[PDB]
Amino acid sequence: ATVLLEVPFSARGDRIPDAVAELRTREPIRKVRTITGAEAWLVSSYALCTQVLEDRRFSMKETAAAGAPRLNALTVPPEVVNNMGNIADAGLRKAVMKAITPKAPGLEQFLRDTANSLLDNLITEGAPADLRNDFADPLATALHCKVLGIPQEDGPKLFRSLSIAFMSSADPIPAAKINWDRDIEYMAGILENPNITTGLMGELSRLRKDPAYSHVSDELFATIGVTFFGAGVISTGSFLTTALISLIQRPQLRNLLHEKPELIPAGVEELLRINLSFADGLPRLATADIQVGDVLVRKGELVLVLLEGANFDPEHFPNPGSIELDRPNPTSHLAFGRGQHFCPGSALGRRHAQIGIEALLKKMPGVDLAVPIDQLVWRTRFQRRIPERLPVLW
Numbered sequence: 001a002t003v004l005l006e007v008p009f010s011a012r013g014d015r016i017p018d019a020v021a022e023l024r025t026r027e028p029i030r031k032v033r034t035i036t037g038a039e040a041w042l043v044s045s046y047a048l049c050t051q052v053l054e055d056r057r058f059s060m061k062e063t064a065a066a067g068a069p070r071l072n073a074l075t076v077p078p079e080v081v082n083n084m085g086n087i088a089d090a091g092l093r094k095a096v097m098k099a100i101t102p103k104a105p106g107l108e109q110f111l112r113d114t115a116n117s118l119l120d121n122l123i124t125e126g127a128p129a130d131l132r133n134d135f136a137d138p139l140a141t142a143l144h145c146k147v148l149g150i151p152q153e154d155g156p157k158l159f160r161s162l163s164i165a166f167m168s169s170a171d172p173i174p175a176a177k178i179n180w181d182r183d184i185e186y187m188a189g190i191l192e193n194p195n196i197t198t199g200l201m202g203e204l205s206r207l208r209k210d211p212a213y214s215h216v217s218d219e220l221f222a223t224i225g226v227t228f229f230g231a232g233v234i235s236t237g238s239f240l241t242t243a244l245i246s247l248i249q250r251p252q253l254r255n256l257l258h259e260k261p262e263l264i265p266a267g268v269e270e271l272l273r274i275n276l277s278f279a280d281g282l283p284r285l286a287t288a289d290i291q292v293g294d295v296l297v298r299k300g301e302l303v304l305v306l307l308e309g310a311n312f313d314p315e316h317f318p319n320p321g322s323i324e325l326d327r328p329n330p331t332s333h334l335a336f337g338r339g340q341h342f343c344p345g346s347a348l349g350r351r352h353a354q355i356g357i358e359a360l361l362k363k364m365p366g367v368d369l370a371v372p373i374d375q376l377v378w379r380t381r382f383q384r385r386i387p388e389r390l391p392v393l394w
């Protein structure tokens, strides 16, 4: 006798487990057990993942309901799960979207200058260099401080809450509340600070005193700051780190992108498609009885949308494990989700990776792992798959 198949399958972000394709072919919708002991429906084909993400009756908001089957414990107050919904209801969607665009004056130049400075520092110190701790993560942090309009010196401390804030835990985390309350207080102080007049916090600070937003709570304004910093920094830092691994393991692609940097945007779209950065399926709670393939999902049940299931589906992306720069459907992947909850920072996430990669190939064209790939230490019980250190030589 064996127990029900458990999720996640592996914390390794450098290879996709053989189990994914086997599930996708035989049972693209099947029952699994999460770390909390709850049962869930794991969805692994492109067709079914898109069906679930395009149907609002599979609710993100309802995953926070008391007594619901859970993928993991909340690291934020339950109302924060409905973050975008709260921003939309406050009439703040357009303002937040405009503040997080990579097209702001001098922002891409700031990204290039920051990427170049970080790399020059690594070259001066000499090999081995750690590309996560000393390149990808400081670059993500520096970008988000600039986008938020907060001092660059405040970035490292806000960053330090992240190894706990984005844990995928079976039980509540006391440290997550300590850090959350402290970071909310920091953001409340930013709103009241007269020096903060640019970026997202500068804009929220002015909307806060505008009569058309007088009834929006100060709780929501601080929340926007903490959530966009956290989600953006963890997502861009983790994606860039694992995209660099995908690139290092493909010297032919690395040489082509160095020779023809105009192909970098098409390269990043493929790096996004094959990315294993999300450690768990995206969770949704059924608010009705809905047919998904061969299964009638019952109201109150948890559904997990496996992004790599969709992104490595041979029926949508032929030869899925291969990076191909001339696919007819390049942006049709689910790396940024789909539907109601499509990533609001997708444009900024793309630009961060494109600039980071462009600067790396120019400064370190001979970049290679300084350790056998099996020596990378993969972070466990976390919302992202990331190596603790990324040792390289050049």
Ligand code: HEM
Residues within 6 Å of the ligand: 060, 081, 083, 084, 085, 100, 227, 228, 229, 231, 232, 233, 235, 236, 239, 240, 277, 282, 283, 334, 335, 336, 337, 338, 340, 341, 342, 343, 344, 345, 346, 348, 349, 350
């Ligand atoms: C490579 C970069 C990124 C990747 C791969 C990524 C991926 C995702 C994915 C897949 C979702 C959907 C989650 C779901 O439907 O359950 C999501 C949502 C979100 N992302 Fe991104 N993201 C990235 C960068 C960013 C950036 C730069 C920001 C902000 C500055 C950001 C802010 C958010 C927020 C706030 C949501 C929640 C949307 C909602 O609840 O409706 N992301 N992201």
Ligand SMILES: C[C@@H]1NC(=O)[C@H](Cc2ccc(O)cc2)NC1=O
Residues within 6 Å of the ligand: 076, 080, 081, 082, 083, 084, 227, 231
């Ligand atoms: C996903 C949902 N929306 C949010 O904005 C925050 C912040 C967030 C955004 C994207 C993530 O991958 C994680 C958290 N919390 C939530 O529970």
